[PDB]
Motif scaffolding. Structure first.
Motif, mmCIF file in Angstrom:
data_model
loop_
_atom_site.group_PDB
_atom_site.id
_atom_site.type_symbol
_atom_site.label_atom_id
_atom_site.label_comp_id
_atom_site.label_asym_id
_atom_site.label_seq_id
_atom_site.Cartn_x
_atom_site.Cartn_y
_atom_site.Cartn_z
ATOM 1 N N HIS A 2 35.486 48.523 29.069
ATOM 2 C CA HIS A 2 34.493 47.800 29.608
ATOM 3 C C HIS A 2 34.686 46.348 30.259
ATOM 4 O O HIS A 2 34.160 45.708 30.520
ATOM 5 C CB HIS A 2 33.483 47.747 28.868
ATOM 6 C CG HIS A 2 32.793 49.447 28.853
ATOM 7 N ND1 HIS A 2 32.771 49.990 27.597
ATOM 8 C CD2 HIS A 2 32.667 50.431 29.391
ATOM 9 C CE1 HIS A 2 32.151 51.165 27.435
ATOM 10 N NE2 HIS A 2 32.286 51.372 28.662
ATOM 11 N N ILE A 3 36.297 46.297 30.272
ATOM 12 C CA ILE A 3 36.292 44.864 30.363
ATOM 13 C C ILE A 3 36.291 44.088 32.685
ATOM 14 O O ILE A 3 36.396 45.743 33.031
ATOM 15 C CB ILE A 3 37.847 44.190 30.090
ATOM 16 C CG1 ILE A 3 37.642 43.833 28.700
ATOM 17 C CG2 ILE A 3 38.396 43.337 30.755
ATOM 18 C CD1 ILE A 3 39.266 44.270 28.114
ATOM 19 N N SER A 4 35.575 43.619 32.741
ATOM 20 C CA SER A 4 35.317 43.893 34.008
ATOM 21 C C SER A 4 37.111 43.344 34.759
ATOM 22 O O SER A 4 37.218 42.793 34.354
ATOM 23 C CB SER A 4 34.560 42.738 34.837
ATOM 24 O OG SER A 4 34.952 41.070 33.864
ATOM 25 N N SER A 5 37.423 44.307 36.097
ATOM 26 C CA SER A 5 37.976 43.537 37.134
ATOM 27 C C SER A 5 38.431 42.152 37.311
ATOM 28 O O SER A 5 39.839 41.692 36.706
ATOM 29 C CB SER A 5 38.292 44.231 37.806
ATOM 30 O OG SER A 5 37.809 44.009 38.763
ATOM 31 N N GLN A 6 37.401 41.317 37.466
ATOM 32 C CA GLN A 6 37.418 40.376 37.670
ATOM 33 C C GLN A 6 38.200 39.101 36.026
ATOM 34 O O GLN A 6 39.029 38.167 35.876
ATOM 35 C CB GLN A 6 36.139 39.206 37.765
ATOM 36 C CG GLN A 6 35.489 37.837 37.573
ATOM 37 C CD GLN A 6 34.900 37.462 37.125
ATOM 38 O OE1 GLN A 6 34.048 37.188 36.495
ATOM 39 N NE2 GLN A 6 34.686 36.627 38.856
ATOM 40 N N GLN A 7 37.450 39.956 34.815
ATOM 41 C CA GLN A 7 38.684 39.142 33.459
ATOM 42 C C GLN A 7 39.403 39.410 33.085
ATOM 43 O O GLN A 7 40.415 38.682 33.035
ATOM 44 C CB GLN A 7 37.570 40.403 32.179
ATOM 45 C CG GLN A 7 38.924 39.135 31.120
ATOM 46 C CD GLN A 7 38.316 37.998 31.123
ATOM 47 O OE1 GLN A 7 37.490 37.402 31.198
ATOM 48 N NE2 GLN A 7 39.701 37.892 30.432
#
Ligand SMILES: *C(=O)[C@@H](NC(=O)/C(=N\OC(C)(C)C(=O)O)c1csc(N)n1)[C@@H]1N=C(C(=O)O)C(=C)CS1
Length: 244
Positions: A2-7
């Protein structure tokens, strides 16, 4: 996961930032390319392939029976750029050490004419090798990170126009790391340039389940940088993305 693509993008960018370089790493999942890093526009820019070209050189030499995979290329006794190269080796040992003198001998057995033909035929980079067989991998030949990752993809899936067994033999030379069930196959490159130096690491991850994820790291190398930075950033990136 669930890590964001931004991150993800920020983490991988920061790996290039922390190494004081400019770079990109391209990842291919199926047909889809993704570009990460701190200089994304490097992705469709052309650079000399440097030693990434050993992959194709080997493919050509084997396919055309210029060498076998067990043959021992003898050190001729002359001082070589690195002492680790001052020994007798197979194509596979030479790949691992990126030993130019072995790969130059092989290019010379292949010869300039057949080498142009094979490079035109495989459509590798801009496909221009000019008139020096011993050393064209300083111009005129150039290639983009997108082209390199697509070359890796082909090779990983045995799509290049060479016998199946030629491709397997070369792939076997490229194993550089096993991590938690995953195998990383790749070739490094370090070219001296116009005003800068290009750093490459082009290959794929073979996961336990059999899926192959191709990648190509491309960055600028600077004085006092170890070659293994290319590896560190690659492993970090692929780890961040959960590919390994
Ligand atoms: C492959 O990339 C090899 N690189 C080179 O021979 C080139 N430059 O390398 C020197 C001058 C030794 C350097 O350290 O910069 C080169 C080839 S075409 C071009 N314009 N420059 C070997 N490969 C590696 C590697 O990491 O794979 C090396 C560490 C240097 S030798």
């Amino acid at each position: 996961m669930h890590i964001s693509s931004q991150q993800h993008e920020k983490a991988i960018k920061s790996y290039f930032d922390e190494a004081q370089t400019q770079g990109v790493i391209i990842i291919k999942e199926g047909k889809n390319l993704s570009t990460y890093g701190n200089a994304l526009a490097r992705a469709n820019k052309e650079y000399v392939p440097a030693s990434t070209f050993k992959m194709l050189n080997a493919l050509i030499g084997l396919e055309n029976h210029k060498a076998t995979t067990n043959e021992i290329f003898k050190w001729d006794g002359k001082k070589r750029t690195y002492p680790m190269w001052e020994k007798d080796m197979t194509l596979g040992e030479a790949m691992a050490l990126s030993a130019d003198p072995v790969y130059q001998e092989l290019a010379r057995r292949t010869g300039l004419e057949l080498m142009q033909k094979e490079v035109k035929r495989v459509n590798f980079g801009n496909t221009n090798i000019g008139t020096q067989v011993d050393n064209f991998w300083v111009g005129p030949l150039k290639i983009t990170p997108v082209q390199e990752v697509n070359f890796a993809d082909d090779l990983a899936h045995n799509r290049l126009p060479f016998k199946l067994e030629t491709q397997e033999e070369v792939k076997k030379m490229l194993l550089i790391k096993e991590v938690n069930g995953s195998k990383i196959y790749a070739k490094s490159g370090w070219g001296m340039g116009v005003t800068s130096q290009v750093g490459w690491l082009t290959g794929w991850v073979e996961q336990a389940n059999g899926k192959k994820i191709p990648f190509s790291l491309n960055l600028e190398m600077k004085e006092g940088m170890s070659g293994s930075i290319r590896n560190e950033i690659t492993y970090k990136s692929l780890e961040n993305l959960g590919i390994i």
